[PDB]
Amino acid sequence: MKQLILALDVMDGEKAMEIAKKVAEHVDRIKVNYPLVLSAGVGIMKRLSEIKPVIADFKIADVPYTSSLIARIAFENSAESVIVHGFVGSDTLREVCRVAEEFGGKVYAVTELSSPGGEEFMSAVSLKIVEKAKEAGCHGLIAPSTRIERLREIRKAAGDMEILCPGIGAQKGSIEAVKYADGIIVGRGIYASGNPAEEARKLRRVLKI
Amino acid sequence: MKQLILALDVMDGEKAMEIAKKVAEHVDRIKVNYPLVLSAGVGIMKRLSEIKPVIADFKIADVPYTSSLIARIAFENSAESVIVHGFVGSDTLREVCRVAEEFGGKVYAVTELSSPGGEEFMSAVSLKIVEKAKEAGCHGLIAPSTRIERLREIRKAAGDMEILCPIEAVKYADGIIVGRGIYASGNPAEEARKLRRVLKI
């Protein structure tokens, strides 16, 4: 039951909807971020939620109260889950994860970003984040597919928590990560294609999910 | 002169404008966060900026490309500055401060959150974040007012960077961020005068 999740990082809401409809046979969930949400309005999440379950990747990273409100707004706009940064601490994790459950939704905690800068501070506390997120009652984790040894460590520490991994798609990091991941997140490889439906179909076969 | 900054922490856009009109003349800048911007639309920053300059407290915390897109949208909607997390790495700091240059904007890097959770991971790397933000060419920092010794260390590491904090902190801070305390009173003019006196060192 592994997933292909589309990071629908286009900034035009109508284009976003067009792409979402095109890939419905091959993609399991859609993840949105702030450039789309700020450009199209938070209501774009309600529209997209009528096509696929929507993960609000808002990288929530504030004190508990503000973080709570952001999560609540996401769920009021039909998100099925939100993404929070574990680095900001257990109080925010507990609060956001409880709010999500009050809406019947899920939270994924970021262990470390897939960018080089993620190595500077996040890598060193990634495994501690896993335990804080587990203890805070959170459902899942976001972890890189790029750092395979680290992904293995995270899976070991996570036990059965759901893990989603950003991956370029049609690249070895993504293929290897499949064993440890519950879902692979792909962005521009699909949404910037001349034929997003065909690209999504190809990637499922390449990832063997 | 040290600054007084209004944290406009409501979710209704018309209420936010009503508050800004009443309190405007008494503060230097207005800070908005995502609950307001998501509820009212990012256009609320444009309308507020016509009253006082707006800091977009978006706690920007993504990979460099996406972070830059977020910063760009904030500046496109008239924000004078944005707040970014340094914890996510120097590459994001650089790219966001790179974007700010295009708009003549400022970037404030978060050293550590003022909540208890900030002590779990952020406190350990706070001073290193200052160094990265400084080397990234960022204008300023956000730092807690409730951890005085740490604030002292942050000022030391910051050099002349602008530090904003949400009396003991005043000697280190270039500005203080205050919310409901200013206006929920019967009288923002009087509350502001007291705060200006606190800031007058």
Q: What is the DSSP string of B21-46?
A: HHHGGG-SEEEEEHHHHHHH-THHHH
Q: What is the distance between the alpha carbons of residues A207 and A201, in angstroms, rounded to a whole number?
A: 10
Query: Do B192 and B26 touch, CB atoms closer than 8 A?
Result: yes
AA letter at B189:
A
Select from A184, A131, A157 the least CA-distant residue to A5: A184
Measure CA of the first residue to CA of the last residue in chain A; give whole Å: 8
Phi-psi category of B163—alpha, beta or left, where left has phi over 0 and alpha has psi -120 to 50? Answer: beta
Residue B25, classified by CB atoms within 10 Å of its CB into exposed (0-12), middle (13-18) or buried (19+), is exposed
Which contiguous run of DSSP H or E holds residue B3?
strand B3-7
The partner residue sitting opposite A35, judged by closest CB among B73, B86, B120, is: B73
**CA angle (A53 as vertex; B38, A199 as ends), nearest 5:** 110
Q: What is the distance between the alpha carbons of residues B199 and B13, in angstroms, rounded to a whole number?
A: 30
Q: What is the distance between the alpha carbons of residues B160 and B77, in angstroms, rounded to a whole number?
A: 28
Residue of B nearest to A111 (CA): B88
> Quick check: B87 and A121 CB within 8 A?
yes
Which residues pair with residue A142 across a beta bridge?
A110, A164
Query: How do strand A29-32 and strand B106-110 relate by DSSP bridges?
Result: unpaired
Q: What is the distance between the alpha carbons of residues B107 and B105, in angstroms, rounded to a whole number?
A: 7
Select from A116, A66, A74 the least CA-distant residue to A92: A66
Q: Hey, is the C-beta of B116 within 8 angstroms of any chain A C-beta?
A: yes
Cβ count near A184 (within 10 Å): 26
Taking CA atoms, B102 is separated from B76, B80, B81, B98, B136, in Å, by 11, 12, 12, 7, 15
Token pair in block for residue A164? 């989603």
AA letter at B131:
E
Q: Hey, is the C-beta of B123 within 8 angstroms of any chain A C-beta?
A: no
Helix axes B64-76, B90-103, angle to 10 degrees: 30
Binding-site residues of A for substrate sit at 9, 31, 57-66, 114, 166-176, 187-188
Select from B180, B147, B183 the least CA-distant residue to B165: B147
Helix axes A90-102, A64-76, angle to 10 degrees: 30
Query: Do A131 and B102 touch, CB atoms closer than 8 A?
Result: no
Phi-psi category of B159—alpha, beta or left, where left has phi over 0 and alpha has psi -120 to 50? Answer: left
Going along chain A from its start, the domains and CATH numbers come out as 1-209 (3.20.20.70)
Which residues pair with residue A82 across a beta bridge?
A56, A107
Chain B CB contacts of A93 below 8 Å: 117
Looking at chain B, the residues that come just before a C–N gap of over 2.5 A are 166
CA B103 to chain centroid: 17
Residue located via tokens 């109508």: A14
Q: What is the distance between the alpha carbons of residues A111 and B85, in angstroms, rounded to a whole number?
A: 15
Which contiguous run of DSSP H or E holds residue B164?
strand B162-165
Q: What is the distance between the alpha carbons of residues B181 and B184, in angstroms, rounded to a whole number?
A: 6
Binding-site residues of B sit at 9, 31, 57-66, 114, 166-168, 179-180
Half-sphere exposure of A79 (CA within 13 A, CB side): 26
Residue of B nearest to A71 (CA): B35
Radius of gyration for chain A, computed over Cα atoms and rounded to the nearest angstrom: 16
Residue located via tokens 């370029």: A168
Token pair in block for residue A129? 């984040």
AA letter at B113:
L
DSSP state, residue B167: -
Q: Phi, psi (5° rounding) for residue A3?
A: -115, 150
The partner residue sitting opposite A117, judged by closest CB among B9, B89, B119, is: B89
DSSP states of B59-128: EE-S-HHHHHHHHHHHHHTT-SEEEEESTT-HHHHHHHHHHHHHHT-EEEEESS-SSGGGGTTHHHHHHH
Which residues pair with residue A54 across a beta bridge?
A30
Q: What is the distance between the alpha carbons of residues A169 and A173, in angstroms, rounded to a whole number?
A: 8
The partner residue sitting opposite B90, judged by closest CB among A42, A70, A117, is: A117
Q: Hey, is the C-beta of B128 within 8 angstroms of any chain A C-beta?
A: yes
Q: Which residue spans within chain A are E strands per DSSP?
A: 3-7, 29-32, 54-60, 81-85, 106-110, 140-142, 162-166, 183-186
The partner residue sitting opposite B121, judged by closest CB among A42, A59, A125, is: A125
Q: What is the distance between the alpha carbons of residues A131 and A109, in angstroms, rounded to a whole number?
A: 11
Binding-site residues of A sit at 9, 31, 57-66, 114, 166-176, 187-188
Experimental method: X-ray
Which contiguous run of DSSP H or E holds residue A86?
none
> Quick check: A117 and B64 CB within 8 A?
yes
Among the listed residues B46, B59, B132, B194, the single catalytic one is: B59
Residue located via tokens 């459950």: A101
Which residues pair with residue A50 across a beta bridge?
none
AA letter at B187:
N
DSSP state, residue A7: E
Half-sphere exposure of B83 (CA within 13 A, CB side): 25
> Quick check: B114 and A63 CB within 8 A?
yes
Q: What is the distance between the alpha carbons of residues A128 and A56, in angstroms, rounded to a whole number?
A: 24
Q: What is the distance between the alpha carbons of residues A64 and B158, in angstroms, rounded to a whole number?
A: 27
Q: What is the distance between the alpha carbons of residues A60 and B117, in angstroms, rounded to a whole number?
A: 13
Query: Do A102 and A71 touch, CB atoms closer than 8 A?
Result: no
Query: Do A115 and B92 touch, CB atoms closer than 8 A?
Result: yes
* DSSP 3-state percent helix, strand, coil across chain A (nearest 5): 50, 20, 35
Q: What is the distance between the alpha carbons of residues B5 and A115, in angstroms, rounded to a whole number?
A: 33
Query: Do A170 and A195 touch, CB atoms closer than 8 A?
Result: no
Measure CA of the first residue to CA of the last residue in chain B; give whole Å: 9
Which contiguous run of DSSP H or E holds residue B165?
strand B162-165
